[PDB]
Amino acid sequence: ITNLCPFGEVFNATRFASVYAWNRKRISNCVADYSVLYNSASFSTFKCYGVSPTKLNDLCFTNVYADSFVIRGDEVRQIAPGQTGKIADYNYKLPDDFTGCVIAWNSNNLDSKVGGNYNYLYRLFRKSNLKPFERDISTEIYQAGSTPCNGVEGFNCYFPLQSYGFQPTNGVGYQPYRVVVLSFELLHAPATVCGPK
């Protein structure tokens, strides 16, 4: 008779996504117990803005989004409203309006390999900043100077994204941190997502 929103798929997925192509999962028609989230001792950051996770086990929202991706430790600061840097501006931007939670944890035992795990990637350039909750998976060669490169890389013309070098001996912060971001939707629409208490 179970019918809970599947947060087990979001947090316990064996492989995650690179931040430039961050995975979004929707939450609809279900009842989710949020006490499983905050009360499991494997989270290094659980910043909630404008909402408390211990106090919405009552209210029903229109729908909940769970964005999940993988960055490095020093970049978890950028997953916040009003931040700047290569991740907040070119990879995953949060609005200043943000109401939700950015949950993150150290994953050096899953997303590391001896010779480096280059499977996670981040965007270095684009000609403009990301709108909030925008996902740009473009691979167009970034034109850095006056020279226009018609699809061929060369001088002042680089590939727009590079890959992390996650080797397990790197100091903390050059280590992979998995991140899950919960955004909340509710006002003038049927609500199908809430909790028990």
């Epitope: 989270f43 950051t45 659980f46 910043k47 909630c48 408390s52 106090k55 600061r77 509710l186 006002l187």
Partner: antibody
């Protein structure tokens, strides 16, 4: 009980002395809580001093308290600190620590407060 | 940032009757993205820590009797004590939390009229 906060004992100081009082959270899920510090002067109302997230030690002060005191946090032991460099007699009050799981959220967990009196 | 003012300062209501405490802000504290007012009501008795009674203008915290009710929106808010009782003699503060710095009201003292 989800979370309860326990504060430093009552401290009787003299002017000019340093002072650092504590507030310790016992329970699971402390990573969510944003510890704040409220001051209540004898026979007056409550004044909000500042708030701190121990995960990053990101702290915001209120304009009437920035620079005058500092708000530390030791994440490894679920403790948030409040410290004076040199106590003035204007600091004699009760100091409550208050917690809420998030920023711009209600303060739903309160400590017993530490009275601090600074005179002979 | 937002400053709050509540009224009356003191209030005397006889047992079983209704007590009303208004609280006005200098700025509206209404997130339109969720449509909730980010205002809270606290109770504090002498020698005791403050107690959160009502958050989001109209939502009661656990351990709070249903005799307590707050409502209103935008700029003016009110916490109503339905059927006042002796254990309610206390000071009641209204606090905002729309933006930091958080601020309280100056406090309202409720007492029993005999």
């Amino acid at each position: 009980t989800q979370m309860q906060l326990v504060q430093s004992g009552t401290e009787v100081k003299k002017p000019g002395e340093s002072l650092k009082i504590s507030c310790k959270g016992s329970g699971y899920g402390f990573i969510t809580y944003w510890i704040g510090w409220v001051r209540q002067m004898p026979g007056k109302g409550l004044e909000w001093m500042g708030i701190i997230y121990p995960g990053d030690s990101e702290t915001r002060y209120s304009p009437s308290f920035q620079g005058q005191v500092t708000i530390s946090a030791d994440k490894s032991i679920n403790t948030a600190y409040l410290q004076w460099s040199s106590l003035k007699a204007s600091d004699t009050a009760i100091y409550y620590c208050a917690g809420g799981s998030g920023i711009s959220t209600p303060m739903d967990v309160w400590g017993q407060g530490t009275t601090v009196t600074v005179a002979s | 940032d937002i400053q709050l003012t509540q009224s009356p300062d003191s209030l005397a209501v006889s047992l079983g009757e209704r007590a009303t405490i208004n609280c006005k802000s200098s700025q509206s504290v209404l997130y339109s993205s969720i449509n909730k007012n980010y205002l809270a009501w606290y109770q504090q008795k002498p020698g005791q820590p403050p107690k959160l009674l009502i958050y989001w203008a109209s939502t009661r915290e656990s351990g709070v009797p249903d005799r307590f009710s707050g409502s209103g929106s935008g700029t003016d808010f009110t916490l109503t004590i339905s059927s006042l009782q002796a254990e309610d003699v206390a000071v009641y503060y209204c606090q905002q939390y729309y933006s930091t710095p958080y601020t309280f009201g100056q406090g309202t003292k409720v007492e029993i009229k005999r």
